[PDB]
């Protein structure tokens, strides 16, 4: 890691940040060479991610800082700019609006800002972005359910929970069941048809 | 032996079967009891759609086990 001096310094900057002191962001070491880090960000209040905490995989590519760190959500999340399957992120500063002087703290706060406001014009996940536009209320409840199931947020829809339980009772994988129902407007018939398609 | 067959609306029926019955035989028993044509039936167990040619024993489906009936969609 040729950039190791800088990553160590930016790591320490997050550790000492005001935003870490306010439990908004944090970072942890993964490998002993600082080429992989684990970030975490708080769901903003008055969003469906409130009360949740989201862990982030941060990999530093050999071409950093000319190319950006590669960041993905470890914690599953329902958001138009994040893949509901992989955690991959679509965000300007992580692709062609990256500037070499940007810091790890900036990246973490940009992601927390993304949770406050989606950019559905430039989505990662077309299914989620479609729902966000076409049925904002179901989008909100679906995001809240994922924040409860995956990110530790308080309880969500008991009706969504019962649909998930019913399909898990057929023996389908829980995560597959959640994404099938969330992707099919919580319609048990069509989510089950998706599950049977693989 | 008896097994249960449950539909997506939670309605449950009881079927008398043999461990050596094929899933094709089971679909026919469901037709005899409920009137649903075999060609419209899909039976699910342990998160998998069952194949017509295998037996209940092959799938470890045993007494008082529950199979899930998912009818084919209009299309």
Swiss-Prot record, chain A:
Active site: 90
Domain UBA, chain residue ranges per copy: 158-198
A GO-annotated cellular component: filopodium tip
Reactions catalysed, as given in the entry: S-ubiquitinyl-[E1 ubiquitin-activating enzyme]-L-cysteine + [E2 ubiquitin-conjugating enzyme]-L-cysteine = [E1 ubiquitin-activating enzyme]-L-cysteine + S-ubiquitinyl-[E2 ubiquitin-conjugating enzyme]-L-cysteine
Phosphoserine modifications at: 157
Residue positions where N6-acetyllysine is found in the record: 12
Cross-link (Glycyl lysine isopeptide (Lys-Gly) (interchain with G-Cter in SUMO1)), chain numbering: 12
Residues in UBC core domain copies: 2-152
GO molecular function annotation: ATP binding; ubiquitin conjugating enzyme activity; ubiquitin protein ligase binding; ubiquitin-protein transferase activity; ubiquitin-ubiquitin ligase activity
Keywords of the record: Acetylation, ATP-binding, Cytoplasm, Isopeptide bond, Nucleotide-binding, Phosphoprotein, Transferase, Ubl conjugation, Ubl conjugation pathway
Main location, first listed in the record: cytoplasm
Pathways involved: Protein modification; protein ubiquitination
Tissue: Expressed in all tissues tested, including spleen, thymus, prostate, testis, ovary, small intestine, colon, peripheral blood leukocytes, T-lymphocytes, monocytes, granulocytes and bone marrow mononuclear cells. Highly expressed in brain, with highest levels found in cortex and striatum and at lower levels in cerebellum and brainstem.
PTM notes: Sumoylation at Lys-12 impairs catalytic activity.
Top-level EC class: transferase
Swiss-Prot/TrEMBL induction comment: By aggregated low-density lipoprotein.
Function text: Accepts ubiquitin from the E1 complex and catalyzes its covalent attachment to other proteins. In vitro, in the presence or in the absence of BRCA1-BARD1 E3 ubiquitin-protein ligase complex, catalyzes the synthesis of 'Lys-48'-linked polyubiquitin chains. Does not transfer ubiquitin directly to but elongates monoubiquitinated substrate protein. Mediates the selective degradation of short-lived and abnormal proteins, such as the endoplasmic reticulum-associated degradation (ERAD) of misfolded lumenal proteins. Ubiquitinates huntingtin.
Protein family per UniProt: Belongs to the ubiquitin-conjugating enzyme family.
Official protein name in the record: Ubiquitin-conjugating enzyme E2 K
């Amino acid at each position: 890691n040729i950039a190791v001096q800088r990553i160590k310094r930016e790591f320490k900057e997050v550790l000492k940040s005001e935003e870490t002191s306010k439990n908004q962001i944090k970072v942890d070491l993964v490998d002993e060479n600082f080429t992989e880090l684990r970030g975490e960000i708080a769901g903003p209040p008055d969003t469906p991610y409130e009360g949740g905490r989201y862990q982030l995989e941060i990999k530093i590519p050999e071409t950093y800082p000319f190319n950006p760190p590669k960041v993905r959500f470890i914690t599953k999340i329902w958001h138009p700019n994040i893949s509901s399957v992989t955690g991959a992120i679509c965000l300007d500063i992580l692709k062609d609006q990256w500037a070499a002087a940007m810091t790890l703290r900036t990246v973490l706060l940009s992601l927390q800002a993304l949770l406050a406001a989606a950019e559905p014009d430039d989505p990662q996940d077309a299914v989620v972005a479609n729902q966000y536009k076409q049925n904002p209320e179901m989008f909100k409840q679906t995001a809240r359910l994922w924040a409860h199931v995956y990110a530790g947020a308080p309880v969500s829809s008991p009706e969504y929970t019962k649909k998930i339980e019913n399909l898990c009772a057929m023996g389908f994988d829980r995560n597959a069941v959640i994404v099938a129902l969330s992707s099919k407007s919580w319609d048990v018939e069509t989510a089950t048809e998706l599950l049977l398609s693989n | 032996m008896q097994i249960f067959v449950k539909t997506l609306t939670g309605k449950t029926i009881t079927l008398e079967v043999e461990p050596s019955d094929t899933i094709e035989n089971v679909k026919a028993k469901i037709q005899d009891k409920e009137g649903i044509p075999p060609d419209q039936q899909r039976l699910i167990f342990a998160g998998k759609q069952l194949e017509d040619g295998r037996t209940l024993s092959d799938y470890n489906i045993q007494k008082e086990s529950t199979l899930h009936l998912v009818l084919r969609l209009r299309g």
